[PDB]
C-alpha cells in the first residue's frame, strides 16, 4: 500500500511549530534509562534555555508527568501500557505498535517487544533493532495504521488505533468493523517497520544536527 501519507503526517506532527523534532531523540534516550526525566536535565543535554524546553513540552499535550512535574512518558513511557518495550534489563512501555518499531533506531538499542493481538488477545512478540526486525511471533503478524490528525491528542487520535495483530486476515476482519477511522490500513509488521525507517531517515534530515 501507499505509506507516504502516513510518513508525511507523522513527521509534520513533530515538525510542527515548537514540535518535539529536536527534543525527541535525547528525551527518548533519557526515558530509556527507566527514570523520570527533569526539564533541567533535558535543558542541560540540549543546551537550551528552560523557556524553550517548556514551550516544546507545552504543545505535546499527551506528555505524562509525575507528582514533581518530571517527565514519565512521551511515546516511550514508565507507565504500563499494552506494548512492552524491554531494553537492557529495564521493563519499559510504548504508546503504540509503531512506536516500538521506531524507537530502537533512535535510541541506538535493540528491544524485546511484546503485546497481545487487539482482535483476539493472542500473545505477540518480536525483536526490534536499529536496522531489522527478527523473532516475529507469529510470523504473519500485522499492524493497524490510521492517518494522524494534526491538532488532535496524538494518543486518542493515533496511538490507540495502532495495534499488533496475530495475522493480516485477522486484522482485516477487525478493520471491516472500524471503517469510521480515517485512513485505516492493515499492513504486515515488516511493512510497518519500513514505514518507521522512512520516518526516521526523514526525521534525521531535519534535526538541525
Site residues, Hg ion (CB under 5 A): 95-96, 99, 159
Minimum CB distance to Hg ion, residue 80 (Å): 15
Q: What is the CA radius of gyration of the chain?
A: 16
Nearer to Hg ion, 40 or 178 (CB): 178
Which of 66, 88, 96, 153 is catalytic? The answer is 96
Which of 117, 159, 160, 173 is catalytic? The answer is 159
Beta bridge mates, 164: 143
Nearer to Hg ion, 43 or 198 (CB): 198
Minimum CB distance to Hg ion, residue 43 (Å): 25
Nearer to Hg ion, 85 or 174 (CB): 85
Minimum CB distance to Hg ion, residue 126 (Å): 17
b/e sequence 54-76, b meaning 16+ C-beta within 10 Å: eebbeebebbeeeeeeebbbbbb
Which of 99, 117, 160, 173 is catalytic? The answer is 99
Strands laid side by side in the 142-145 sheet:
164-165, 142-145, 185-188
DSSP state of 148: P
Query: Burial, 135: exposed, middle or buried (Cβ in 10 Å; 0-12, 13-18, 19+)?
Result: exposed
Nearer to Hg ion, 16 or 52 (CB): 16
Q: Which residues have CB under 8 Å from 80's CB, separation 6+?
A: 93
> Which residue minimizes CB distance to Hg ion?
96
Nearer to Hg ion, 169 or 182 (CB): 182
For residues 106 and 29, give the distance between their C-alpha atoms in angstroms, rounded to a whole number.
8
Beta bridge mates, 114: 84, 125
Minimum CB distance to Hg ion, residue 158 (Å): 6
Which is nearest to 9 in space by CA: 150, 200, 197, 159? Answer: 150
Minimum CB distance to Hg ion, residue 58 (Å): 20
- Asked whether the beta carbons of 142 and 184 are under 8 A apart, the reply is no
**99 in catalytic set:** yes
DSSP state of 117: -
Residues serving a catalytic function are 96, 99, 159
Amino acid at each position: 500500500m501507499k505509506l507516504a501519507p502516513y510518513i508525511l503526517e507523522l513527521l509534520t506532527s513533530v515538525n510542527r511549530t515548537n514540535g518535539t523534532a529536536d527534543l525527541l531523540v535525547p528525551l527518548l534516550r533519557e526515558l530509556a534509562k527507566g527514570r523520570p526525566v527533569s526539564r533541567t536535565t533535558l535543558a542541560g543535554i540540549l543546551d537550551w534555555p528552560a523557556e524553550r524546553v517548556a514551550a516544546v513540552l507545552e504543545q505535546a499535550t499527551s506528555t505524562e508527568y509525575d507528582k514533581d512535574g518530571n517527565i514519565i512518558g512521551y511515546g516511550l513511557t514508565l507507565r504500563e501500557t499494552s506494548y512492552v518495550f524491554e531494553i537492557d534489563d529495564r521493563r519499559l512501555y510504548a504508546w503504540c505498535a509503531l512506536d516500538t518499531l521506531i524507537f530502537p533506531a533512535l535510541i541506538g538499542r535493540t528491544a524485546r517487544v511484546s503485546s497481545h493481538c487487539a482482535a483476539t488477545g493472542a500473545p505477540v512478540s518480536l525483536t526490534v533493532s536499529p536496522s531489522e526486525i527478527q523473532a516475529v511471533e507469529p510470523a504473519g503478524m500485522a499492524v493497524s495504521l490510521v492517518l494522524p490528525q494534526e491538532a488532535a491528542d496524538v494518543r486518542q487520535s493515533f496511538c490507540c488505533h495502532v495495534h499488533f495483530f496475530a495475522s493480516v486476515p485477522t486484522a482485516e476482519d477487525w478493520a471491516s468493523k472500524h471503517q469510521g477511522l480515517e485512513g485505516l490500513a492493515i499492513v504486515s509488521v515488516h511493512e510497518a517497520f519500513g514505514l518507521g525507517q522512512e520516518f526516521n531517515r526523514h526525521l534525521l534530515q531535519t534535526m538541525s544536527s
